[PDB]
Amino acid sequence: TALNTXAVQKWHFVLXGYKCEILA
């Protein structure tokens, strides 16, 4: 699940095996 509150991004991408998360 992705949460888009304000002008910030709090989503987590975990698929295949590699984990990529951007909190900017």
Next chain:
Amino acid sequence: TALNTXAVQKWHFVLXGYKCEILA
């Protein structure tokens, strides 16, 4: 502190505003 090479490792890369890390 390196990419999964033979034994058990993990590549660490962080540049700009993105934090992505691989795990083997």
